[PDB]
Structure formats: C-alpha cells, structure tokens
Amino acid sequence: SGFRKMAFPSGKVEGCMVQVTCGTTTLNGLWLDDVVYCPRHVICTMLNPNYEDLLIRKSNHNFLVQAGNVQLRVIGHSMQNCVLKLKVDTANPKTPKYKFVRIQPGQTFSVLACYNGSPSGVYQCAMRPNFTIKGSFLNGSCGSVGFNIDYDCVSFCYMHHMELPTGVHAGTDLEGNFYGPFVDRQTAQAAGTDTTITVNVLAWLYAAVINGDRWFLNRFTTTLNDFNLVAMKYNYEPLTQDHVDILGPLSAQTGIAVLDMCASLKELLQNGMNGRTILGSALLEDEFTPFDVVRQC
Amino acid sequence: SGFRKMAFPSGKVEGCMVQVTCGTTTLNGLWLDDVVYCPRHVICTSEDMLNPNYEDLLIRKSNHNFLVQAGNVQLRVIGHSMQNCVLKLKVDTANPKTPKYKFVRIQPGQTFSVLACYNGSPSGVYQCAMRPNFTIKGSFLNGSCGSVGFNIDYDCVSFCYMHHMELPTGVHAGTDLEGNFYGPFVDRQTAQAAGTDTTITVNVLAWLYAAVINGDRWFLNRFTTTLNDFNLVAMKYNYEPLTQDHVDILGPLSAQTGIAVLDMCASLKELLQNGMNGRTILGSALLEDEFTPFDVVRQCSGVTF
Numbered sequence: 001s002g003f004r005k006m007a008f009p010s011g012k013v014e015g016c017m018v019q020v021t022c023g024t025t026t027l028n029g030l031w032l033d034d035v036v037y038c039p040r041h042v043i044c045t046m047l048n049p050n051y052e053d054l055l056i057r058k059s060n061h062n063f064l065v066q067a068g069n070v071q072l073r074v075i076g077h078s079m080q081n082c083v084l085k086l087k088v089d090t091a092n093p094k095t096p097k098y099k100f101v102r103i104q105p106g107q108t109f110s111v112l113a114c115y116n117g118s119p120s121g122v123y124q125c126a127m128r129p130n131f132t133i134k135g136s137f138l139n140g141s142c143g144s145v146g147f148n149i150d151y152d153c154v155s156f157c158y159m160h161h162m163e164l165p166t167g168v169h170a171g172t173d174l175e176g177n178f179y180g181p182f183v184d185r186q187t188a189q190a191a192g193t194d195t196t197i198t199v200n201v202l203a204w205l206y207a208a209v210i211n212g213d214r215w216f217l218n219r220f221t222t223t224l225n226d227f228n229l230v231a232m233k234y235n236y237e238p239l240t241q242d243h244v245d246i247l248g249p250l251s252a253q254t255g256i257a258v259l260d261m262c263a264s265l266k267e268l269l270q271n272g273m274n275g276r277t278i279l280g281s282a283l284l285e286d287e288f289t290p291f292d293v294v295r296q297c
Numbered sequence: 298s299g300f301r302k303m304a305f306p307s308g309k310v311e312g313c314m315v316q317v318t319c320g321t322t323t324l325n326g327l328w329l330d331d332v333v334y335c336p337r338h339v340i341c342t343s344e345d346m347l348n349p350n351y352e353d354l355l356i357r358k359s360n361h362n363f364l365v366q367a368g369n370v371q372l373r374v375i376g377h378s379m380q381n382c383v384l385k386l387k388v389d390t391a392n393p394k395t396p397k398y399k400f401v402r403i404q405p406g407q408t409f410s411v412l413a414c415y416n417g418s419p420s421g422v423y424q425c426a427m428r429p430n431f432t433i434k435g436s437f438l439n440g441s442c443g444s445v446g447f448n449i450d451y452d453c454v455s456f457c458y459m460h461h462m463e464l465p466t467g468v469h470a471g472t473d474l475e476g477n478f479y480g481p482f483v484d485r486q487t488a489q490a491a492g493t494d495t496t497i498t499v500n501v502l503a504w505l506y507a508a509v510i511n512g513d514r515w516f517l518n519r520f521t522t523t524l525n526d527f528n529l530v531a532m533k534y535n536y537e538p539l540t541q542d543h544v545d546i547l548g549p550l551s552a553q554t555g556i557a558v559l560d561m562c563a564s565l566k567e568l569l570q571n572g573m574n575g576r577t578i579l580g581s582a583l584l585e586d587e588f589t590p591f592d593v594v595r596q597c598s599g600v601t602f
C-alpha cells in the first residue's frame with residue numbers, strides 16, 4: 001500500500017545521454033544507434049534566428065559530442081523541425097529498445113533532468129491541457145528527455161527546449177515537433193488557459209479509495225452531462241465516455257460506479273475539502289493517469 | 298527554474314537488483330560484489346511469521362533452498378550468513394555491474410531515493426524522507442520487500458535503507474544494509490507501534506527558501522522571532538524543535554536569498570498559526586518537509602552524477 005508519484009527507473013535513458021557543444025553553447029543530446037538528437041538552438045548566438053541560415057554556416061567538425069569521456073566523431077548533420085540529428089561514427093552500445101511517441105495532453109511521463117550530458121535526477125510530470133509541463137529545468141537542461149517504459153521498451157515522448165516567462169516548460173517530441181504553439185525563439189509567448197485533467201483526478205480518488213481513504217465517498221450519483229456542467233464551471237476538462245471506459249477496471253476493483261465517483265468529485269469541487277486531505281494532499285491531484293494508478297495499485 | 302521532488306538517477310542501483318527465492322517466498326535482493334543482501338524473513342513460512350526463531354530456521358536451510366535469479370541468469374549460492382535482520386547469500390560470480398558504494402546509517406529527517414522493485418525487477422523510483430519516528434511513507438506492495446534506498450555522491454552509491462515490512466497502519470519500516478532496523482521495529486507479524494511523528498522543521502524551512510528562489514514569496518513577513526519563541530509555536534504544532542545546528546545548515550540558503558533564518562522562521566510561525574488561506578507554495582496546499590537544505594542547494598545548482 002501507499003501512494004507516491006513514481007518515475008520510471010532511469011538507467012536505460014542514462015545510457016543514451018551525451019553532451020553536445022556547438023560554438024559556445026553546450027546542452028544535452030540523446031544517443032540512439034548511430035544518431036544523436038538534440039535541440040537545434042545549440043547552433044545559436046536568439047530573438048529571431050533563421051535556423052536554416054545559421055545551420056548553413058556549421059560543418060560536422062563544428063559539433064563536439066561527448067559520451068562520458070569518449071569523444072564521438074560526427075559524420076553527418078541534418079535539421080528536422082526543432083531537433084538537430086548528428087550522425088556519428090559509432091552506434092551507442094547501450095541503445096535500449098525504443099520508440100518515438102507523441103503523447104496526448106493529460107498523459108504522464110518521467111523526465112531525466114541532465115546538465116552537460118550527465119544526470120542530476122528523475123521525476124514524473126504531465127503534459128498539461130495547454131501543452132506545457134511544470135518541471136525542474138535550469139540553464140543547460142535543454143535536451144533532457146521525457147519517457148515512458150513498457151517492460152523492455154523506452155518510448156521517448158519529450159525533449160526539453162525552453163522556459164516560458166511564466167516559469168512553465170515547453171518542448172518537442174523526438175521528431176522535433178513542439179507540443180503546443182510554441183516556437184524556439186526568445187520571445188514572450190503565451191501558454192494558453194490551463195485546465196485540470198478530470199479523468200486523472202477521478203483515477204486518484206479511485207487510488208485514495210483503494211488505500212482506505214473513503215471520507216469523500218458521498219451518497220449521491222449524477223449524470224455525465226450534469227457533472228460536465230460542473231466541470232466546465234471549475235475549469236475541469238469535459239469528461240467523455242472514452243474516459244468512463246478507461247476508468248472501468250478501477251470501477252470494478254472498488255465496486256464504485258464511475259458516475260458515483262463523479263458525484264463525489266462534484267461535491268468536492270462545490271464545497272472544497274474542508275481542511276482535510278486525500279492521500280496526503282490538500283488539493284485535487286490531476287497528474288496520475290488511470291494507467292498510473294493501476295500500475296502502482 | 299522550477300522545483301520538483303526529484304529522485305536520484307537509478308541506473309547504478311538497477312544493475313544490482315536480483316530476485317531471491319526461498320521455499321514459496323520470493324522477494325528482492327541487492328547484489329554487490331559476490332554477496333546478495335535481502336531480508337531474512339524470506340526464509341519464513343506462513344505459520345512461522347508471528348514469532349520466527351530465525352537462527353533455528355536458518356539452520357534447517359541449505360544453499361540450494363535459496364534461488365538467486367538475475368535476469369535470465371541464475372546465480373550459484375555458495376554460503377549463507379545472517380547479519381542482524383539481513384541475509385548475506387554469497388554467490389560464485391561477482392556482480393560485473395557493481396557500482397562504487399558505501400553502506401550508511403542515515404538520521405531521521407534525511408532523504409533518500411527508493412528503487413521500488415518486484416521479482417528483482419525495477420518498477421519505479423521516488424524520493425522520500427525517514428520520518429522522525431523512523432518510518433517511511435512510501436509505495437510498497439507485496440514482493441516490494443528488499444527494495445533499497447540510497448543517495449549518490451557523484452560517483453559512489455550510499456545505500457541506507459532496505460525495505461522489510463508494512464506496519465498494520467500502512468507505513469513502512471526497514472533496516473540499514475547491516476540489517477539493523479531503523480526504529481523499534483522487529484521483523485515479526487505482530488502489531489507494533491510507530492509512535493508519534495513530528496514534522497521535520499529544518500526541511501520545511503529549506504523548502505520555503507526553495508520557494509522564494511523560485512518566485513514564490515507571498516508568505517514572507519515583516520516580523521522576526523528567536524529560536525526559543527519559535528520552538529514554542531513549533532512544539533504546539535508537532536514540529537521538531539529547531540537547533541542552532543539546523544540554523545547553521547540553512548546559512549547558505551539565507552545568504553543566497555537575503556532572508557535571515559530567524560526571519561524565515563517568523564514567516565513559518567505565522568503559517569502554522571493561520572494556514573495558507575487556500576493558497577499554494579510551490580504547488581502545494583500543505584507544508585512540505587521532505588527536502589533537506591542539501592536537497593535544495595543540490596537541485597537549485599543542478600548537481601550531476
């Protein structure tokens with residue numbers, strides 16, 4: 001029992017992390033097979049780069065790639081969306097089975113925060129509805145990646161690129177397509193209104209229940225359309241039938257019908273928590289997916 | 298910027314986790330050089346667990362009653378020792394992946410990372426604190442036994458915790474890697490009292506500094522206090538008394554922020570007496586005490602391994 005925000009073991013990703021330097025700039029790259037992936041702004045001196053015109057000026061020898069102390073030799077370079085892809089003479093012997101994945105808003109993943117090619121720490125976070133993440137990313141953290149692990153397979157879903165003036169974080173998938181509307185330029189850019197991930201809050205109540213926290217369990221039910229009315233009011237994401245289907249196995253575990261759980265949540269939204277806690281949080285937690293709960297419970 | 302509860306990178310420990318089986322009980326072991334460390338309660342039986350005589354039980358046991366599996370490989374158990382509450386199963390092969398490591402006994406209030414494992418296979422990593430009452434509030438399911446807690450100092454893995462049991466209340470208890478329990482607990486199936494917990498005052502202060510460093514200053518007040526008057530508020534709220542040693546350890550944080558320790562304490566006093574008024578600090582509606590002052594500086598300066 002017990003319930004913690006857990007990250008995936010980071011070892012398979014630790015073995016892919018390298019340092020990439022171009023000119024003055026150093027950040028992190030991901031080394032898989034004989035390719036090294038990193039943010040393309042590694043080639044910048046920043047307020048509106050022409051990335052094609054700045055890339056042109058660079059040649060293979062202008063890129064220094066270091067895997068621990070081993071200096072890799074760069075035999076090719078190309079730019080795909082917002083990532084640069086450096087061909088190196090040497091396939092990474094520690095490449096795990098991996099995939100590249102574009103996650104949907106609401107899904108979760110682990111971040112291995114790195115500096116100069118070396119790991120500092122690992123932590124779990126969620127792709128917000130507005131396509132940002134609330135991480136811990138200092139200068140030099142760019143190129144750190146987010147990932148999920150299924151048995152033996154590393155699904156890479158995020159690579160870090162920037163901090164917004166608000167202090168949240170934006171980045172790309174490993175094809176270099178930004179999540180959200182952001183661009184890799186040094187402007188004030190607006191995230192967008194955020195919202196809570198309702199299907200994740202419900203999953204976490206199911207987790208609370210499984211752990212003996214049941215005080216919020218009310219004697220009401222509600223309808224999907226009537227709950228949704230309340231969720232719009234409290235900037236919660238609309239709950240869909242797909243979400244109900246997803247919450248089914250937790251419903252049958254606890255014997256609490258999803259729409260019953262929705263009525264408990266409605267009353268929580270409408271009257272607060274009254275100073276109590278749920279799984280040791282005084283807030284409604286929306287960064288656990290239904291899959292996350294099942295994996296841990 | 299940003300501040301997260303961050304675990305150490307777990308790679309060096311992942312290569313040390315194995316699956317240990319004795320009779321019908323399987324759980325996790327830690328394989329370092331030619332030794333596999335695990336909870337001795339692995340040798341026990343359903344009917345033995347109210348008060349096992351571990352010495353008697355260990356004598357009836359033969360190396361070949363112990364199956365240490367490492368991935369697809371199976372390791373050759375050569376010897377069997379018992380050190381306090383841990384078993385020491387000597388195997389033929391040394392772990393080629395053995396990190397540089399230490400065994401360390403930590404203090405209440407310090408933090409570490411747990412690599413939660415089931416069947417010798419890593420499941421997830423998370424950062425937690427040894428509570429003042431020597432329990433931990435983790436996430437541990439049957440078969441999570443023998444998972445380990447550690448800290449990393451650039452190169453060297455300091456193992457401090459090995460998980461043994463869940464108390465009837467749902468919190469966790471375990472030992473150091475010499476098998477000595479943290480707290481009054483014993484490795485038997487009986488009710489055992491954790492006894493009163495307190496909040497780790499020095500860690501709450503460290504986390505308020507982390508909040509200031511990250512732009513979250515609303516709680517900063519125009520007051521001061523002394524240690525003694527602070528420690529009167531704190532005891533009322535089951536906060537650990539703050540010592541001069543604690544104030545000394547916060548000094549680097551006071552210096553980078555411009556906020557005297559006792560000033561920050563005055564702000565915490567007010568927070569205990571009046572709550573947060575529905576507001577958050579670093580995303581939390583409660584006061585967080587699982588970041589030590591070393592954790593804050595480490596994360597905020599981006600230390601690496």
Ligand SMILES: *[C@@H](O)[C@H](Cc1cccnc1)NC(=O)[C@H](CC(C)C)NC(=O)c1cc2c(OC)cccc2[nH]1
Pocket residue numbers: 001324338343346437438439440441442443461462463464484485486
């Ligand atoms: C780790 O494998 C679990 C710890 C745990 C975690 C969460 C909830 N419960 C237990 N394994 C254990 O071995 C603990 C150790 C005791 C000393 C607390 N549990 C048992 O050892 C145990 C109890 C038990 C019972 O009920 C008494 C019946 C059959 C087998 C069994 N094993």
Ligand SMILES: *[C@H](O)[C@H](Cc1cccnc1)NC(=O)[C@H](CC(C)C)NC(=O)c1cc2c(OC)cccc2[nH]1
Pocket residue numbers: 027041044046137138139140141142161162163164165166183184185186187188298
């Ligand atoms: C890459 O290491 C840093 C990552 C970082 C640093 C500190 C905190 N969090 C993340 N990212 C950058 O240097 C990028 C470079 C891009 C634009 C090519 N820029 C930003 O991350 C950035 C620009 C910017 C602006 O506009 C100047 C305003 C506020 C915040 C902000 N962040």
